[PDB]
Amino acid sequence: STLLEPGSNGVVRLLGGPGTGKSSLLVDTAVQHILDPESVLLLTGSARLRTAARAAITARLGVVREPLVRTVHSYAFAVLRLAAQPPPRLITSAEQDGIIRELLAGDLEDGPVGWPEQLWPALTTAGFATELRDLMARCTERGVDPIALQRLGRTAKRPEWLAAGRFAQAYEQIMLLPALGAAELVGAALEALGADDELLDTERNRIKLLLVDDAQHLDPQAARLVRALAAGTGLTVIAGDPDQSVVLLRDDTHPAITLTQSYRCAPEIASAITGLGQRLPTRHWTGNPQREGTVTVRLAASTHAEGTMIADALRRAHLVDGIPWSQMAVIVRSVPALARALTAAGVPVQDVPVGRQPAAAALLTVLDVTATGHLDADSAVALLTGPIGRVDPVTLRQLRRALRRAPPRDFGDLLVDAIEREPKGLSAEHARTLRRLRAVLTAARRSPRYTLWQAWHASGLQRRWLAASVGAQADRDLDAVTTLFDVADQYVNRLRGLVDHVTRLAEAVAVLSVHGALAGEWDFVVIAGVQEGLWPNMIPRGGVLGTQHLVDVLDGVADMTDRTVSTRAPLVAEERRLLMAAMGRARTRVMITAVDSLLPSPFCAEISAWATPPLVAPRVLAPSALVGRLRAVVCAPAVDDDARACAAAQLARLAAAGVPGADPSQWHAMTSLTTEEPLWSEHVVTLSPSTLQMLTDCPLRWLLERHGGDDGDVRSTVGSLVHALVSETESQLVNELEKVWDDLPYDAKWYSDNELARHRAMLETFTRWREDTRRQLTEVATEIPVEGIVVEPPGVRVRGRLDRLERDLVVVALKTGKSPVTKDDAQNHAQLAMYQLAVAAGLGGKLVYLGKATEREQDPKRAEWLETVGEAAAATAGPRFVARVNNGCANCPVRSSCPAQ
Numbered sequence: 068s069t070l071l072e073p074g075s076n077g078v079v080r081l082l083g084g085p086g087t088g089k090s091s092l093l094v095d096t097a098v099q100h101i102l103d104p105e106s107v108l109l110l111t112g113s114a115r116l117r118t119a120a121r122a123a124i125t126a127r128l129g130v131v132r133e134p135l136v137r138t139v140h141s142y143a144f145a146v147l148r149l150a151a152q153p154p155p156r157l158i159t160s161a162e163q164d165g166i167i168r169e170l171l172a173g174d175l176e177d178g179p180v181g182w183p184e185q186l187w188p189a190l191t192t193a194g195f196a197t198e199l200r201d202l203m204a205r206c207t208e209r210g211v212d213p214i215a216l217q218r219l220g221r222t223a224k225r226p227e228w229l230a231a232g233r234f235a236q237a238y239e240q241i242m243l244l245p246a247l248g249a250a251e252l253v254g255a256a257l258e259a260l261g262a263d264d265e266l267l268d269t270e271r272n273r274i275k276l277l278l279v280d281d282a283q284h285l286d287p288q289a290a291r292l293v294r295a296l297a298a299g300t301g302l303t304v305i306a307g308d309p310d311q312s313v314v315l316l317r318d319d320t321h322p323a324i325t326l327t328q329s330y331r332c333a334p335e336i337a338s339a340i341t342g343l344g345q346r347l348p349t350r351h352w353t354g355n356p357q358r359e360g361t362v363t364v365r366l367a368a369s370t371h372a373e374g375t376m377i378a379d380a381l382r383r384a385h386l387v388d389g390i391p392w393s394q395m396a397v398i399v400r401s402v403p404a405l406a407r408a409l410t411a412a413g414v415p416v417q418d419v420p421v422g423r424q425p426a427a428a429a430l431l432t433v434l435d436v437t438a439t440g441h442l443d444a445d446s447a448v449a450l451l452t453g454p455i456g457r458v459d460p461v462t463l464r465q466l467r468r469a470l471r472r473a474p475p476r477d478f479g480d481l482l483v484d485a486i487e488r489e490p491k492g493l494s495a496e497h498a499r500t501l502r503r504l505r506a507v508l509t510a511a512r513r514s515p516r517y518t519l520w521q522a523w524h525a526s527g528l529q530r531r532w533l534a535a536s537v538g539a540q541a542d543r544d545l546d547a548v549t550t551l552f553d554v555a556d557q558y559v560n561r562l563r564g565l566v567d568h569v570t571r572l573a574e575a576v577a578v579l580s581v582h583g584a585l586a587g588e589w590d591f592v593v594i595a596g597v598q599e600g601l602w603p604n605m606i607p608r609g610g611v612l613g614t615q616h617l618v619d620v621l622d623g624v625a626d627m628t629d630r631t632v633s634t635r636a637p638l639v640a641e642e643r644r645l646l647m648a649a650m651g652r653a654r655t656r657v658m659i660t661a662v663d664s665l666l667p668s669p670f671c672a673e674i675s676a677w678a679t680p681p682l683v684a685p686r687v688l689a690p691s692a693l694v695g696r697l698r699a700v701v702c703a704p705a706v707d708d709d710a711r712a713c714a715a716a717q718l719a720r721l722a723a724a725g726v727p728g729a730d731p732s733q734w735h736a737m738t739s740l741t742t743e744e745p746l747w748s749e750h751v752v753t754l755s756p757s758t759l760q761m762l763t764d765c766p767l768r769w770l771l772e773r774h775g776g777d778d779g780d781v782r783s784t785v786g787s788l789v790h791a792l793v794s795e796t797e798s799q800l801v802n803e804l805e806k807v808w809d810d811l812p813y814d815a816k817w818y819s820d821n822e823l824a825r826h827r828a829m830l831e832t833f834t835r836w837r838e839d840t841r842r843q844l845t846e847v848a849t850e851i852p853v854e855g856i857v858v859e860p861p862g863v864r865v866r867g868r869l870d871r872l873e874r875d876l877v878v879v880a881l882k883t884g885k886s887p888v889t890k891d892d893a894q895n896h897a898q899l900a901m902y903q904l905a906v907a908a909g910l911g912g913k914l915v916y917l918g919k920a921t922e923r924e925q926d927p928k929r930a931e932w933l934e935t936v937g938e939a940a941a942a943t944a945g946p947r948f949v950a951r952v953n954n955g956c957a958n959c960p961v962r963s964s965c966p967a968q
């Protein structure tokens with residue numbers, strides 16, 4: 068307190084625990100030294116914390132000037148910006164590792180670097196250049212010149228470090244023949260402070276406070292600017308906590324100021340944090356005595372039961388205890404499953420490429436129409452099913468039946484000719500969704516960053532997405548089209564190149580990882596997923612170049628020149644700091660969750676000493692979770708004679724205000740049939756001989772598969788293309804099947820010409836059948852429509868398409884199956900005996916199998932048969948259809964709604 072005064076000098080160090088008044092004491096000394104705007108320099112260490120401390124000072128200060136609030140990287144650029152009295156910075160690592168892919172492919176083509184010849188197949192891989200980039204990016208943070216990395220390649224017998232140092236030296240000579248990376252920005256500025264030797268004295272004479280902040284995360288190359296700027300003038304405060312590694316604080320000759328009172332954390336949270344610091348290689352601080360807090364550890368028995376009790380405890384707190392959303396958080400060790408099972412209880416919770424999302428990709432299809440000049444068929448259907456002018460799949464089927472009234476032509480060709488000029492056919496409501504697509508393609512074709520805005524103006528849906536903000540998808544799409552207008556501007560400053568480049572490119576529960584959870588406050592913190600393979604991280608840190616072994620020989624004597632512990636797993640004592648500092652955010656209470664069928668980590672057995680069987684079916688406060696259970700203890704045979712009264716007493720309070728599922732009108736077991744009528748009632752039923760086999764077999768399959776339920780093929784229309792050719796010279800028919808075959812929906816075009824071969828020969832099999840049996844038979848006609856009245860008084864009235872007559876009359880029915888029906892199974896064949904009974908009365912049978920020509924016969928039992936047609940056709944009358952189990956109870960369409968299974 069006596070060391071922070073306007074009359075004072077030197078370096079003061081300010082260290083304290085997690086939560087204490089550190090960063091709000093640098094703001095308290097920024098203002099107290101002003102009451103000069105300049106020399107009040109901060110180094111906040113984040114781009115978002117720079118504005119958090121700027122607005123804190125400038126509100127506490129009649130207009131004012133600005134204290135200089137910056138970061139370390141943004142300050143080392145301003146030194147380089149002034150030392151050129153412009154120093155440019157290179158792009159993000161796409162353009163910086165696009166240089167790495169060139170120098171490796173430019174080395175494998177040759178035979179100077181000298182890779183150790185085992186790594187020769189590795190050099191073309193994308194996974195080698197994203198590891199070579201890290202051996203340079205982790206020496207750049209530690210100030211190691213490539214002429215000094217090669218000294219390590221000789222003292223130890225490691226050939227791939229001499230090869231890596233010669234890469235990092237040859238890399239820095241084509242980047243200067245400047246161009247600075249991201250991490251190379253502090254190290255390049257520090258060479259320019261000691262170069263001029265008057266640039267120092269014209270910098271130190273400016274600054275007066277140097278309120279550097281968050282000193283613990285500072286690199287040993289960024290820890291030397293703070294030692295250079297604070298060489299001599301005024302007074303400097305360092306601050307931060309020294310025992311959270313994850314200027315220097317631990318070793319200094321400068322006087323320190325400790326802080327032990329927390330101001331945030333409860334005293335029961337402050338004993339679990341400092342209780343874990345006992346088995347850890349200023350660890351004593353106390354909690355806020357005004358608060359009272361709870362720490363508890365819960366276990367689950369599965370993965371889905373974890374997300375069901377997290378969404379329990381997040382729902383108990385807001386809805387009963389009253390703490391709002393956005394004072395809650397869910398911290399996970401690392402993000403790839405939990406946000407889906409936590410939204411399903413009704414909790415507000417706050418990747419995919421840019422040109423792939425449907426609100427953005429529907430507008431890039433307007434540009435491909437515009438760039439070519441004519442719109443195709445496959446990209447004119449893709450505008451109707453998209454967001455611009457939208458149609459559900461049953462209104463494509465209403466366009467086609469209205470456009471084809473203007474063989475039928477294909478829908479891909481009729482659509483384009485309705486956008487080019489609008490026909491006056493439909494005009495009801497489909498005229499509007501076609502005028503919307505003429506308004507876009509006339510605006511963009513009459514006009515590259517000025518056309519793409521003019522398309523967004525014509526397809527007027529910035530108005531429709533603001534009024535409807537289903538209200539989340541408008542805020543997901545508007546937060547995605549504004550990433551086109553940002554990326555499309557970035558290519559214009561440097562329209563077939565627009566499409567070519569983009570193609571390659573509140574009050575909620577914050578779910579975030581541990582490294583993102585070092586800025587929030589959050590009254591309630593859940594640490595989900597502390598278990599065996601996940602939190603004590605046993606993914607081994609080995610690699611090819613030995614990056615994790617270089618980084619702990621070069622940065623300290625953590626390992627000697629022995630590769631024994633170089634590639635094991637993340638260190639456990641340095642992994643305990645993450646769970647010790649994630650609990651350091653909650654100011655009221657902490658819940659720690661892990662599943663155990665997936666085995667809990669040993670950190671869950673250590674918290675249970677300081678906390679205040681696993682669940683397998685947990686309780687929820689979801690409204691669809693109440694009314695499910697309340698209906699299950701009232702519709703019960705066999706417990707709870709007293710609780711049954713309490714069950715139905717609470718459903719009457721749910722049903723009076725809404726809550727769907729509550730009232731006994733809403734229950735799916737309580738609904739009643741619509742009609743239960745006697746069908747036709749009143750009459751002559753009508754039948755065809757191809758349903759009579761089916762009707763007798765099972766009369767429920769007649770009702771559901773003939774009327775509605777029929778799931779759609781390519782094998783049944785070829786079977787009718789054979790019947791058309793056969794009914795019309797055996798070489799004049801092969802030429803007829805050959806032309807028409809090329810338009811059939813066959814994938815695998817090796818199979819279309821392989822299925823033609825068995826259907827070409829099946830016409831030669833038929834003419835090889837005719838000449839054999841034209842001595843015993845004689846054709847009367849072919850494809851006679853049979854119609855008449857049979858079993859007249861109900862009458863059954865057989866109608867339809869006898870295939871081929873012959874005469875010794877007889878009845879020939881041609882089939883194209885491969886496997887024939889047996890000999891004694893065709894004596895009761897219901898199709899032939901309906902034609903045979905047609906031949907007799909008013910106005911033997913053959914069953915020729917073209918394919919694999921084994922024919923079957925039926926002998927010329929009429930009273931036993933004619934009573935069966937009248938007995939079966941009477942069962943197509945009433946309700947309550949019978950579901951017999953037949954041979955066809957497999958590859959039948961209606962089976963998921965059968966009551967016999």
Ligand SMILES: Nc1ncnc2c1ncn2[C@@H]1O[C@H](COP(=O)(O)OP(=O)(O)NP(=O)(O)O)[C@@H](O)[C@H]1O
Pocket residue numbers: 084085086087088089090091092330331585
């Ligand atoms: N004198 C005070 N009176 C009331 N509240 C205070 C006082 N001093 C600090 N606080 C509050 O205590 C909390 C501690 O925040 P602060 O001390 O600024 O964080 P920090 O410890 O510097 N940063 P970090 O450890 O990374 O979370 C904040 O909500 C402050 O507003």
Ligand code: SF4
Pocket residue numbers: 765767768950951952953955956957959961962965966967968
């Ligand atoms: S599964 Fe059996 S009862 Fe059901 S429709 Fe098919 S044949 Fe008829």
